A paper describes a structure:
Polycomb repressive complex 2 (PRC2) is minimally comprised of four proteins: enhancer of zeste homolog 1/2 (EZH1/2), suppressor of zeste 12 (SUZ12), embryonic ectoderm development (EED), and retinoblastoma-associated protein 46/48 (RBAP46/48). Structurally, PRC2 is organized into an upper catalytic lobe comprised of EZH1/2, EED, and the C terminus of SUZ12, and a lower regulatory lobe containing RBAP46/48 and the N terminus of SUZ125. One of the key biological activities of PRC2 is to methylate histone H3 at lysine 27 (H3K27me), with H3K27me2/3 being most relevant for repression. While PRC2:EZH2 exhibits a higher intrinsic methyltransferase activity for chromatin and is allosterically stimulated by H3K27me3, PRC2:EZH1 has a higher affinity for chromatin and higher chromatin-compaction activity, suggesting that it may be more directly involved in gene silencing.
Residue numbers in the entry:
A (entry chain A): 31 to 73, 80 to 124, 272 to 322, 432 to 477, 518 to 727
B (entry chain D): 11 to 56, 60 to 91, 111 to 157, 169 to 410
C (entry chain B): 76 to 440
D (entry chain C): 78 to 146, 155 to 167, 182 to 216, 229 to 256, 295 to 322, 352 to 361, 427 to 482, 485 to 501, ...
Write the structure that this text describes.
Amino acid sequence: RLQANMGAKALYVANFAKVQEKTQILNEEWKKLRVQPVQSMKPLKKCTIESIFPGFASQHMLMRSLNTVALVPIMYSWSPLQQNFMVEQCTPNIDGPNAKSVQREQSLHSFHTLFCRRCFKYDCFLHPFHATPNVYKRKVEWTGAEESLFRVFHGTYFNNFCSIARLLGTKTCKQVFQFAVKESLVYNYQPCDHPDRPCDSTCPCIMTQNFCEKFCQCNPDCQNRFPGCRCKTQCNTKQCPCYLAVRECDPDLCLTCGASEHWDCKVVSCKNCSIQRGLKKHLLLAPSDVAGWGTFIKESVQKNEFISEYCGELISQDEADRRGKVYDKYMSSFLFNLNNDFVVDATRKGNKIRFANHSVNPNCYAKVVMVNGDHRIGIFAKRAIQAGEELFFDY
Amino acid sequence: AVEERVINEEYKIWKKNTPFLYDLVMTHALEWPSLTAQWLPDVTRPDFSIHRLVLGTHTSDEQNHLVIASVQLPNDDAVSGKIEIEIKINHEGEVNRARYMPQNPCIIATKTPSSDVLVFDYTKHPDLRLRGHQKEGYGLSWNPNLSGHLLSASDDHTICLWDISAVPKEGKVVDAKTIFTGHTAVVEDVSWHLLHESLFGSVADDQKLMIWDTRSNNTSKPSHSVDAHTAEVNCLSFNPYSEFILATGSADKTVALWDLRNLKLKLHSFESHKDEIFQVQWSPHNETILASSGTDRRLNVWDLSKIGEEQSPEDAEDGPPELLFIHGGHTAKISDFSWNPNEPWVICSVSEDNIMQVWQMAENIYN
Amino acid sequence: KKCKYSFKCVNSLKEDHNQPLFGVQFNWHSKEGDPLVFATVGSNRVTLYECHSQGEIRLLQSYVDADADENFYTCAWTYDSNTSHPLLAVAGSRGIIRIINPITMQCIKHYVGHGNAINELKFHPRDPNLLLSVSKDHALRLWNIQTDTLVAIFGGVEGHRDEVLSADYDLLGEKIMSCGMDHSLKLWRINSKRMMNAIKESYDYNPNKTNRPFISQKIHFPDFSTRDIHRNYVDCVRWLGDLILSKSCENAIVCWKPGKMEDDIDKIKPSESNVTILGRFDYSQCDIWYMRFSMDFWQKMLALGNQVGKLYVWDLEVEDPHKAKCTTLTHHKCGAAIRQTSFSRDSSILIAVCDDASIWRWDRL
Amino acid sequence: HVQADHELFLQAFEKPTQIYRFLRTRNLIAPIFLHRTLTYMSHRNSRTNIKRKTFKVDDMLSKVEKMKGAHLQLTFTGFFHKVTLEVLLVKVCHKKRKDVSCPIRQVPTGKKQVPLNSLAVSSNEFEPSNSHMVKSYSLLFRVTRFVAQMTVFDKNRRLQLLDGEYEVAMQEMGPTLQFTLRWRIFYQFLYNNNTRQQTEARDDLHCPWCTLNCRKLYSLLKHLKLCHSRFIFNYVYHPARIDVSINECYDGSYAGPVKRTPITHILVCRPHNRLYFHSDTCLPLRPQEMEVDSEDEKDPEWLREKTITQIEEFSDVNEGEKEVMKLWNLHVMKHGFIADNQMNHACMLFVENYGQKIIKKNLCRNFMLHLVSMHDFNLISIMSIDKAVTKLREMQQ
Ligand SMILES: [Zn+2]
Ligand SMILES: [Zn+2]
Ligand SMILES: [Zn+2]
Ligand SMILES: [Zn+2]
Ligand SMILES: [Zn+2]
Ligand SMILES: [Zn+2]
Ligand SMILES: [Zn+2]
């Protein structure tokens, strides 16, 4: 209850001792220095200092100017980004010594529940929850580690003893055979769950008024799914199937455009997958001659050419409502509504294209684009723009 | 919107080009727009000479101020000069026309939007009221020869003539010494003949120039009546040098010349102004020069001696030969303009958008 | 024990502009025996000042900038390594950090990297070349004036979510605390290998030899954070050995440290959450924002002001901080709010400012 | 030359020229000021004031007094019947009080021999006299070896029949007749300090849009300088060079009863380069390093530290599992993979990028477990996994 007053006093006198010797060695370091004293000018504006107490006269001194400096506008702290963001049995190590037996479904619980399909990461910043547990579902000495390894290996291979013998190496074909003999006994995309039933009115895909994608685990022979285009040219026109809807090109399905080619180079035929590959223009920051900061572009562009893409924190509608209500005092509303479900708020994080401003005579514009289900922003050009020119687009 | 943008872009082009055309340029804006401008005969000469001006006003929810102003003109040397307002006189309602007496320059008559027009004398400071019309108008003119004689017009089908020399000083209101009424529409200009006080001229909207004799005791029949133009006639002006020759300006986009020895034949019709002409004035220092302006936003000046002369094809592509200059420095309806009687080829011009330019053409043009 | 301090108001100056002052600092880097010197600042008027035994505050220098709209906030003193001259360091609302050399009486150097106003400036105690700067733009900065470049940015996504009001090194110069309006008292570090080799590369920087930009080593991850020591704004924070002293608009100083009482300061993880309130000092009438306290070089005592004028002094050599004997100082003329106080190298002289353009002085006896 | 900047070369020179294409038609149909009157362009004037000495406006009426001191060429044509011919004009008059019948008078003009199967002149021979006695007037055309009229002149002295040839019928007491009546510069374009185009002028001094024929180069330089001022013209004799450049500081604006304040203006009485700043540091960017070291690529370290500390915060994951998780995160973030087939290469990169790291930490078993985990999602084939793990254990062994 109060068994630390003596301990607190002990810690405080120890603090006094250590700060005293610290100040002592600091004084020893300071005594080595020898600096000159202040020296005044002999006494244009003036400055007088009075004295409330008698006995001291009023002291005057001439004023001295100082060199000016170029002021800049106001900017709060931030950090750069290239992808979107979102803000709302132990089974020991197999290589370790204390491993224990565990079945195939229970061994890969953390792996299957934490892995993400739409980005090939673990606990990414746009997929909060996995779709369902059924999406990964499909139609001598033996330690627990070796038992679990043999279990998952025989599960994926379905009793191909030569392959497990090649992979494990230690266990032989005859040993694995005997062991197997002695072992048998305008809305955001969302993957739905209805494998038995067909795509009907109860399915939320038709409710959202959006076409499905590869990531949904529905029937591959369905009609609601969106097959890729078959355009050989750059297909950046209204005749393209993908450019009709808001969607962009697909890497796997759109084989004719040549999206599955090697991404090492940059000269490609498809002039629509720039958001996936990220062939943005090298923007630069500057002080704008209109209001505060602004963005300039280095290289010239074309009409309807890809400049860059907006980035920020994805949040709910009411979240952005309260955030904008908080920003009403500062009068700095850089918000950008994406769709009904989620919206972008890039005040804390973003990129250079956020620093553009609003004008009645625009030259760029924005467009919502569903890249692989991700509703991203695409900041395209509404006019052929020169180098070092200001960029504006109506919000 | 795009038309006024183009007009002011052409004004910017004129502001760029103006240091190759004129010997003098002085653009001034007034507190209120002025439908009247006239140089006075008085002058003061202390490198710049002082000249004087009379100016009207057209106000709205504010007291009117008939302005007697001054201006600083370089004569033959020198970069200085400014506009200054000397005297301001309160006025009953707006102003349509005002004229000074050639005999007594101090007496200045002014019209009102009501019937009672008035006359001021700034040396003593209505000094002399005048009545007889039933509506407003634009016509007013003092006689050059006989003192006190004053003609005025109005759109109520009357032309009043007063003679203020007969009334005593106590009598401020004076009835019409006579009222002439021969037209059958809105009469739009009357003016005395210069070197003969016994007649005057007029033009009305009956397509009729009508010349009236003063010796005749019939206030209905004119001395002559001629159909001058195809559309409504607006204004006229007599020649200072000669006596018979005069000029007219009509709403059919034309100026024309006539003579008081044979009024049937039109001597020549000048046509460069592309809208209704509202004012024409002969020059005092030159005989064969005429001027014109209206709502076309370009003040034209013509030379009569250069009439019917052959010229180059590239010179003829610009315009006819008789047209001497087109001062397009304004940006609105040219409300009035006037010449100076003691300087060469310099004029003043007042527009409706608060623009009061004063300018003199280059010597190389006319030589 | 008694007061053991015979304080008496020796002088009370009043400037001829009537603008509230915001900072005052003594030249602690000056040697012993020389005529002492300090410096105060208003909105657009910095003023150096001498001090003698008879209260004769001889006016030394007074600079004023051309733009009058600037609002100065704080000042600091430094000594040059090579020339061995003084150097005043000042800043204000224009986002500028100027360095005045009083011998030449010119603006020898100036730096600009902030968007909005500077709240406080500090210098690393051992190495005199580094310079920390706190600002309202939700981030701190660290510069090196010897090479004329930026060293680091102690801020980022994990930084303060509001205006940053103050910060301070420890006495050894190996760990920095920072506080602001976001109800957070965040720790930093300048002892790891990253900051060390970054400073070493900043010393070896030269824009004329090579043609490259500086690799600014940002820090988007402080080593300790907490949002339970205070509720209102946190206007100032300071170090005492390995203990954190802090104030707030709740009218109470608090002395504490991270973790439990047994937890060492040099072994705190990022995920540490527990704290330990070691003691508190009580006072009243401190509702107005932008209030400060100060200590001497030895840190044997502590001074503080209030929004009425009756300043307070506390001891630190004695034990029992929460049972420590306080001390008050009053006068029948200090009808204004005190913003900051300061001492010389020794604890003899005390000088304080106020919002009525007044500068009060006290001296031991 | 790409089409975009080449179209920008057109478009940047179109919209100033297009207004001048509009002002060209406006200035020709409605001139602002006469071009002859300019002092710098005064060679266009080709006359003097000699005639004014002997002139007199009183004598102008004498000049026009001495000034005061249709030609129906009705030519016949070939007849059509089965020689000589003659035309005649028939005048009809009004009904007078005394006489009851209309006066009739046939005035034959002239004859002319023409074939079948010459001309006749009539130089305004109506002879109506304007005495309210000419009610109508016809024109006959007779033939022989065949006579009829045709309304040539209307009632109001107007032209009834058109020009060209014609034909008519006939009626005695088939035959007919016809008739025919008769009443070097070089525009060196430079925009953004780039030679977008270099041309040579067709004509020597014919302006490019105003199209005035000036016989002097100084007049052309001053005209383009003064008039049509959306460009800045600089020219040097070098066959002549004319360096056209867009005026990016031109005063494109308004620039010109109701109340307003007075002013007095007098003119004549007697005659990229702006500085830059860094993104994160906001320090001044030197001009030497602008294109090199392009920021905003090579994604920042705070995202990597966030991916580290997020999965490190996970409770129900083991040590080696979190190790291979951060390794896979750093691998996929260092090389982004969008296509699913490229993931078959990605594992082949992983052992080629971090295989030596997992050997130094004993993480091969959980690495194969992660491989089987991604295999559960149908991302890669199983023989590819066999190849990858055999290569990994080959380099490890
Ligand atoms: Zn994910
Ligand atoms: Zn579906
Ligand atoms: Zn489906
Ligand atoms: Zn589905
Ligand atoms: Zn595609
Ligand atoms: Zn496609
Ligand atoms: Zn494609």
